[PDB]
Amino acid sequence: TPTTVDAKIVAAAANAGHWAELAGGGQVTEQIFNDRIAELETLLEPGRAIQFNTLFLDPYLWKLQVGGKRLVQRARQSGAPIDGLVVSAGIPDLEEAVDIIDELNEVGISHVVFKPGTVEQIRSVIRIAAEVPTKPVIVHIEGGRAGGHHSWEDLDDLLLATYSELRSRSNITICVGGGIGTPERSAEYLSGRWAEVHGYPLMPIDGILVGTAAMATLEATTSPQVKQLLVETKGTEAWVGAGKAANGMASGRSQLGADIHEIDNAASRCGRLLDEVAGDADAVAERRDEIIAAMAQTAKPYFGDVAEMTYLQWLRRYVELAIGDGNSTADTKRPDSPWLDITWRDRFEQMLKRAEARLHPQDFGPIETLFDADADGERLLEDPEA
Amino acid sequence: WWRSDSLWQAHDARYEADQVCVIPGTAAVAGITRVDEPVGELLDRFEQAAVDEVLGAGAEPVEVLSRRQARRDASGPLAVVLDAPDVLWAGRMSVNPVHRIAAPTEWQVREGSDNRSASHPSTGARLEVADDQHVVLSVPLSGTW
Numbered sequence: 001t002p003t004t005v006d007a008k009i010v011a012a013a014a015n016a017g018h019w020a021e022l023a024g025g026g027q028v029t030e031q032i033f034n035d036r037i038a039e040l041e042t043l044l045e046p047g048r049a050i051q052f053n054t055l056f057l058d059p060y061l062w063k064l065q066v067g068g069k070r071l072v073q074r075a076r077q078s079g080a081p082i083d084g085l086v087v088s089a090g091i092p093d094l095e096e097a098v099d100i101i102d103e104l105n106e107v108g109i110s111h112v113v114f115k116p117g118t119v120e121q122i123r124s125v126i127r128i129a130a131e132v133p134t135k136p137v138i139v140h141i142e143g144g145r146a147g148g149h150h151s152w153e154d155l156d157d158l159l160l161a162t163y164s165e166l167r168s169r170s171n172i173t174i175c176v177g178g179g180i181g182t183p184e185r186s187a188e189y190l191s192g193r194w195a196e197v198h199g200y201p202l203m204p205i206d207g208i209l210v211g212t213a214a215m216a217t218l219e220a221t222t223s224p225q226v227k228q229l230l231v232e233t234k235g236t237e238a239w240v241g242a243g244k245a246a247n248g249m250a251s252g253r254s255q256l257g258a259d260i261h262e263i264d265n266a267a268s269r270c271g272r273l274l275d276e277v278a279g280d281a282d283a284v285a286e287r288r289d290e291i292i293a294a295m296a297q298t299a300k301p302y303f304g305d306v307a308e309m310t311y312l313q314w315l316r317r318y319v320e321l322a323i324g325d326g327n328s329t330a331d332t333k334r335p336d337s338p339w340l341d342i343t344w345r346d347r348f349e350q351m352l353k354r355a356e357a358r359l360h361p362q363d364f365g366p367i368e369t370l371f372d373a374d375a376d377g378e379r380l381l382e383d384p385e386a
Numbered sequence: 387w388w389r390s391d392s393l394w395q396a397h398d399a400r401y402e403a404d405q406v407c408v409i410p411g412t413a414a415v416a417g418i419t420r421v422d423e424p425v426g427e428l429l430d431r432f433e434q435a436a437v438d439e440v441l442g443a444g445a446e447p448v449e450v451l452s453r454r455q456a457r458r459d460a461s462g463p464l465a466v467v468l469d470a471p472d473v474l475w476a477g478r479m480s481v482n483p484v485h486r487i488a489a490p491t492e493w494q495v496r497e498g499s500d501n502r503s504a505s506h507p508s509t510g511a512r513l514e515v516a517d518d519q520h521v522v523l524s525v526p527l528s529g530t531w
């Protein structure tokens with residue numbers, strides 16, 4: 001999501017002659033994402049091809065994917081370079097998977113990508129494989145030792161048990177992933193020598209994915225300070241259960257309750273406080289002083305006392321947080337950067353217009369008819385202080 | 387309010403990076419040392435050292451490795467036609483017509499099999515393939531005359 005959302009890195013990774021999946025978690029519409037593919041295909045040199053990643057998590061995205069898949073359908077009906085589709089966070093049911101495989105863009109899909117997290121999820125994909133035996137299906141088996149979206153399932157035991165049934169389908173391409181930064185450590189899974197430690201006879205793999213080790217890369221959009229942070233983090237051997245920051249890495253749960261692997265060394269303030277607040281919420285009112293100050297430490301600022309705070313302080317706080325002085329929102333608008341906050345600028349307007357709405361005793365003729373003009377209002381907007 | 391949309395601050399932000407949720411994995415972090423190392427370098431580093439390990443023991447300076455530095459191939463012109471499912475026209479990608487030419491053809495003909503230069507694959511759909519000017523592969527389809 002953060003890493004591959006940039007059209008620059010996924011292009012550069014592909015231009016290096018490598019397979020990559022464009023992130024869909026950073027694209028909220030067909031149009032905004034169609035810009036990325038267009039930026040991709042422009043930065044895509046002749047013939048080179050890439051794939052796309054999608055999430056199963058929420059209904060709104062799955063309804064957006066109906067427009068998204070038809071976008072992918074339209075793109076490839078137009079002959080778009082994107083040669084694959086990646087379903088994430090869950091395995092679609094047979095009728096849902098058949099649809100994806102059999103789409104008008106099917107040949108341009110050329111294979112389908114699934115990411116099973118459990119034994120049952122693996123067995124589900126096997127049934128998707130037997131569905132269309134002539135359709136290539138790349139099964140990426142991840143761990144919970146991996147980054148981001150998490151799981152309680154071991155790296156080995158899952159693949160150790162399900163491998164035999166996975167190889168009874170020729171259309172299944174087995175790909176092991178997670179906790180791999182190097183060719184040396186990942187060489188044994190390729191030779192099949194990795195299963196020998198568990199006594200099982202050799203168990204070779206068809207491919208390997210690297211999520212984490214590519215984050216510190218040059219063409220990645222990761223900030224200079226964030227890269228240095230990922231670097232100095234020391235790594236670990238097989239994941240341990242004991243709750244702590246483990247080798248600069250501690251798990252944490254998202255808003256939905258699912259675990260997320262985040263960096264607890266580079267940033268120790270957000271994760272641990274979150275675990276404090278989460279486990280502490282009954283009595284929050286009692287620890288309010290301790291809790292409200294810690295939000296300010298991680299820069300999740302509450303506002304100074306709500307009543308007593310002057311309307312300036314309100315309106316000056318939004319400008320403070322929304323408008324960066326270094327990036328110069330006015331100068332940020334000119335390149336037409338995707339980082340543009342314009343909803344935040346629109347947010348501040350609705351607050352400004354509310355301020356006029358609150359204090360005006362008269363008919364509201366003079367004030368409202370001015371700031372609402374395009375040419376006039378937009379000029380007023382690029383200069384927040386004025 | 388806390389956890390929502392926390393993934394974007396790691397990229398292009400001047401703020402203190404110790405306040406941000408940034409996502410590694412636990413064990414993969416050990417393999418992360420070099421900073422601002424180009425994607426092309428990391429991915430090749432994987433492939434190049436995987437090749438060497440495979441080369442040294444089993445292959446021992448294989449014909450495949452030697453053929454590469456000397457430019458020799460697998461899947462020549464005749465195979466490439468029957469291999470790649472995608473047929474490019476300009477910047478657009480199309481399915482290989484041979485897939486629908488090979489089997490569905492009533493009369494299909496492969497001329498001079500073992501000889502590569504003279505190799506020709508023709509069909510009753512009136513579509514024929516041959517090589518011209520070295521690397522250029524010539525597919526010739528016809529309607530009536």
Ligand SMILES: Cc1cc2nc3c(=O)[nH]c(=O)nc-3n(C[C@H](O)[C@H](O)[C@H](O)COP(=O)(O)O)c2cc1C
Nearest residue numbers: 001088142146147148178179180211212409411414
């Ligand atoms: C920052 C980040 C974002 C990720 N986003 C997604 C995602 O949107 N969908 C998905 O299936 N996996 C996602 N992953 C997981 C990777 O696709 C991959 O499975 C995992 O990172 C591989 O494990 P490793 O990086 O620890 O070696 C993400 C991983 C990271 C580090």
